[PDB]
Amino acid sequence: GGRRRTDALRFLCKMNPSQALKVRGMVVEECHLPGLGVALTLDHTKDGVSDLVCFVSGLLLGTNAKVRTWFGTFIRNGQQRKRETSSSVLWQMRRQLLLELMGILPGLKEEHVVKASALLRLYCALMGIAGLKPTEEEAEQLLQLMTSRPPATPAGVRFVSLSFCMLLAFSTLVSTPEQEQLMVVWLSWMIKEEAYFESFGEMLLLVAMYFHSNQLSAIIDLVCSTLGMKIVIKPSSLSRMKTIFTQEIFTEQVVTAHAVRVPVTSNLSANITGFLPIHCIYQLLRSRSFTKHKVSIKDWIYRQLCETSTPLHPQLLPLIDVYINSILTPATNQPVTEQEILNIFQGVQRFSITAQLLVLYYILSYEEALLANTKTLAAMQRKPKSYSSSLMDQIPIKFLIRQAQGLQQELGGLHSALLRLLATNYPHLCI
Amino acid sequence: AAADVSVWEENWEDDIVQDDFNQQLRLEMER
């Protein structure tokens, strides 16, 4: 009965093709006969990207969750319809999407990178929400798409990030050795490629770190945030991913070497979002990785702290905390020098108020930690290098505390932590 | 001691309110 009704409406729309998309809108409004909608958009396509990509992506990723569930059930049910054959419109639109994949495949073009990105996100939606299981040819052309090289634009960065998240999520679709060597050579090229300034390499380093620290949940959260959808990943395939990643591509040495040269985000703030090099440095510092390799980031920390803006990023304070913990834990990272932070308070190079407050927070926290961790000295007094009293006399603690109190809401927990340190170590400033 | 007034009261260029959508669109497409 449903097949005959769908065929009748199909013939009616063949007789009046101008109203075919109106019938498809009626389908998605009344919320039944999804095969009719798919068939109508297919007969309509028979440049942009395509009406098909827009239509099914909007269906699977729109605000309306009823439509999402309805189309997911449609995809699931259609998948069982003989597992092949053109009897179901599901395989027809799958072939159409695969044909689009061939269309945009080549070095990827500047014009096709955004279309590739949209198509890749649509495939993510299909296999993640709708429960589609790709065929061998579909998986092969997907892998051919991911491993393409976009021409180092922000769209290219987005495309590479999305492809990497697809590989992390749906790693079951490789299942072959030649595709394994294809993806590892693509990963090696991605490592070598660092001209993407104008947030991809940060994601790569972060997933490598999470693999080393077995923070699988962090990887799933990263993938779900980048793809923009909630997916269950079945992390045994993620464990296979961790084995290949750690043993072949990313050792701790290469991770450290690539991370120490990662640039600093100018004008850092909570406004700019996504995964950032600060997250990478925080993750290594929490994993205690540099003392194992004897490499300095004091310059990196100091340079990043000078490049902050008022809506404070929520990762700066934990970064300073773990950096101070790294200093006083054996060998160790060197703390910033006297002259390095005298330049911060040289006025009163006009540095930002949030940079001053983060340096002040670091200094007070460092002194508190030094008082709290005198057991692990194991060297002379110049090794930890407790700060000179003259430099402390140069720092305007009270003025900066008043300024931070004037910007309470914009600085996150910085004002509260500064007040904690002030009330603990400077009672004479708390009269 | 001053006050602010707008020449055109339906001018879409005023940055009195900045919304997230237009923020990322601007940051994404400005060169």
Place this chain on the structure above:
Amino acid sequence: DANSALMELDKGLRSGKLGEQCEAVVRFPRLFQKYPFPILINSAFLKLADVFRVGNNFLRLCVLKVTQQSEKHLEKILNVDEFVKRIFSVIHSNDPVARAITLRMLGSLASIIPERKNAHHSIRQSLDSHDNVEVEAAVFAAANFSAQSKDFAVGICNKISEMIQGLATPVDLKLKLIPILQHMHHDAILASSARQLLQQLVTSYPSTKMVIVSLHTFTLLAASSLVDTPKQIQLLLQYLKNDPRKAVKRLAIQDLKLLANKTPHTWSRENIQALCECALQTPYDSLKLGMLSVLSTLSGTIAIKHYFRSSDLVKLAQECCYHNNRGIAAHGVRVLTNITVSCQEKDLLALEQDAVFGLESLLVLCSQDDSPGAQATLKIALNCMVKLAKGRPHLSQSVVETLLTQLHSAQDAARILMCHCLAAIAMQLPVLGDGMLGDLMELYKVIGRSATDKQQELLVSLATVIFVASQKALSVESKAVIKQQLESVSNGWTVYRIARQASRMGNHDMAKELYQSLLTQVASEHFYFWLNSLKEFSHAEQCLTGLQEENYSSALSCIAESLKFYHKGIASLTAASTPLNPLSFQCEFVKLRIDLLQAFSQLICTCNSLKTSPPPAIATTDLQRCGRISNQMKQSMEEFRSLASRYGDLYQASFDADSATLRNVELQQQSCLLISHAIEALILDPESASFQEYGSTGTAHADSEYERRMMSVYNHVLEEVESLNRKYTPVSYMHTACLCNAIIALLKVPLSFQRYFFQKLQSTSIKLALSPPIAVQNNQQLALKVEGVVQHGSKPGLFRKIQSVCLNVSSTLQSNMTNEMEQRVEPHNDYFSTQFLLNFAILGTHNITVESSVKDANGIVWKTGPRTTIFVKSLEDPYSQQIRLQQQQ
């Protein structure tokens, strides 16, 4: 969760280390912003007050800072007695610092504890303390409590008077004490006694500081009491004229500006004459600028009408508009413009050209400077020109000519401001658009050749005036704009904003080209879908620009093409919708645009349905004799009525939209209603056609060219319908001709995409936390409390403010509307709460729904808040079940 975070802080305040306790205490206000509901606020304030009671003085100061930050949330404490009593216990401490902090807290809590006698006595006792910090805290608390409670004010006025006049009080404490008297407005006799005391102070303590504080306090008291305000104005003018101190004169100017802003109607002619004389005979320019600021404030109000020949005000304004000082010139020309547009009296039309030439000279003065003060004066002048163009339309041509001539010899910032001015004038008066196109296009050509950094704003401003000034479409100007964009502009944002303006003014081919160009520049796929949808909507609106006046077949084909592109666009737009950017208004707006176009197509089909003949069986016996077309017209009428209802639903779901977008939605709804009324009055009920189309507005003051075109189409269609009322039987080809011509007229005016389609500014919501798969007994009916907070983004009341919140509760069983009830509650500090009583006599499963609605200040109801639902499992109690079973068995 709220309580988890509150415990996370509570372990902080329980640590005993001062740093952690202070950290938690200053972490509190963010919690209130996250969870503004009274349960968390109540518990938080009780534990904060306990910490205040037992903590040291620095912790008490931190608690005081938090209380000062959270004066909105303290109305929600509810458990006021325990909170205050454990706060109040610290006033008995021998430490004067602790007493001072307690007094400051009581002053901060004055709104929720007025008429608290122990607090009043504490203030009175601490006022004559020997510790200066305690005395200052007592003065602050006395100010707050006199602002709040009348009894404290009347009980304290004598004591404040005796401390001020007391010779043992220092001058600094006297200064601190005088502003208490501004809160003596609670009673007429109290206000009169305070007035007498302030007069005694100004005559007996004529120091600069003391007289300044006393005069400011007297001004504030007069503003609050508004009975001594005329003689307060007279006193301020006396001090302005007589007192030689520049500081006293400056204060008098500031106070008169405050009174002009507050009570302009109370100003007499004599007061304005005295102020004008003072401005005329003063030698100092700063003072003159201040008095002219006061006079320009007054001229914008009704005080100018009360002031009314060539008087001192006009003489002063004419003298000042040619001053060397730019600020004085701006104020003088503002006064002149206000007089010209407010007073149509023909005795003062000689200054009409004085105003025009003063504005032009001020343009010449301010254009080259490119300095912030000059930019401010330039903004003042251009606002005055816009106002003058509206008020006196016969001066519009000269204003436009001055702006165009000055455009070629002005800096970039100045050019942007005059472009805004031209856009305003041409939006209100589009006849002047044709006269400004040549100069604007020439300046667009010369700017685009060397457009580096600041010219991007200039480029969008110039394109905006080009699109606004163009009543018709563009052929060569369009080519020039596209060439200027493609030649140099890699700035996608400039192109996007210009395309936004093009789609705003209905130049949809240009918008299509620019949006097509903007694809491949974005990185995110949802922005790509958004731009692609914009391109498709522009193409769809461009498709139906080629409509012939009488060709209905061409019309049907064009509407079909437009619907194809609209369906592509809505698929793309749906693909562009994401969480925290749902594009709900855009989706609904273009869905209602897809409808009323396929409804138009169905009405074109029914126009042609008359050519398929009626049956003969029905033809042998009035409206049924028409045949299928009669029922089809009935269906079309119902469809258009439903479309008008849906457009109204979109209207009242757009509380955060700007006025122009709402007017656009109103125009679409009125077009739907026009088609429905035409169908009814021509086919279905010509005898009940009601009165004639007597337009009350007549020559309505439209705010856009789209408005003018829409109303002209409506008036022409209504005239056509009225002349064709009963002249033909409903089988007529002339009725179908009139309907189809109405379709052509409505579609031939291009659609305008308004600001809310692109920019969302207000963004107000409702949280609506309600007390809870919940089991309710059959006999015991549910007691449901719903609490909600209205949320905001940046400027809360940008377009309209919430006056009251309407909470409609309904119950649907077997999840049908069995528990209708409404409660209009006024949210005090952006928070409202109410109790609901829900009957569940019928056993089963109940779906409770609560839908918040917003009644704005004017009275219009908006359906804003979420229609959150909860499900109730109502089951008969064991007692009644067992009793009924035993009785039956």
Place this chain on the structure above:
Amino acid sequence: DPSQQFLQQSLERVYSLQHLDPQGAQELLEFTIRDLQRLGELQSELAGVADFSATYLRCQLLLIKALQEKLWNVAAPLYLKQSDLASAAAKQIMEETYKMEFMYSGVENKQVVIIHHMRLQAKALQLIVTARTTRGLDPLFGMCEKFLQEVDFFQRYFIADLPHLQDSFVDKLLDLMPRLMTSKPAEVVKILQTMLRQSAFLHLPLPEQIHKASATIIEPAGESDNPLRFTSGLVVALDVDATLEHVQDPQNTVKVQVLYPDGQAQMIHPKPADFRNPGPGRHRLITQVYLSHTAWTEACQVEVRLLLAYNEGTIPFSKPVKVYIMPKPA
């Protein structure tokens, strides 16, 4: 004294400036209404006069605002209900005119004529607004002839007061009386609109002595008390004490309204024995109001308020209070 002088000056300022544009006129009215409300808040003796005059000015402000909305209004089939507030304005003028008639004392007939004239204006406004919407001709004729009968009754009752109503709405209406009687309803609506817009604002002659009718519920007090328990099915008696100020005939007019948390509302008519008169223009109402309702899961609060009745229809004149009840079953 300065208060009376300020009151008279403000009223003269409003009356003189009736040649202003609608925006200026309505902003002047808003300024004066705010001033009179504040003056009523400050002074006790002039609270009655200030609130009386401010209510009259609020009626006028609503009228001119509704007429400006009508200027914003267009042809009838294009009328939009959601964006219109003229009908609400007419209802508000209705209720405020009732308020000035009954909720104040010392009202001589020279004020009653002005109150009824504003009432007639509100009825005309409601008629015009309804005509803007209704496509039926028979209901339009019915409301039209009802309004004309109301005008005729006004002319009959206040026949001695017409010379004091020069250039008023009703005066110009009575000038063209038979033409309105014999004209078409649509033409009647049109000329009514034009005559409303051209009507003059009538001066309100202040009485020598006038005080607002006020009431203060004091016995239940705030909700800090524990809920009243054991009320399921049966009755609970809530003792009500109240002081009533300047109500000449409270027994026939004062009523007690009880609003349960559901839509149900109870209306109570206290007997004369409840009312006590310890002083002139200062009554004391002591009585019991009986409340009953089925069992409740949680102790909700019931709103109890005092209303004034007029002749039908009622208007609230006391601050609402709330008390918690827990009708527990047993």
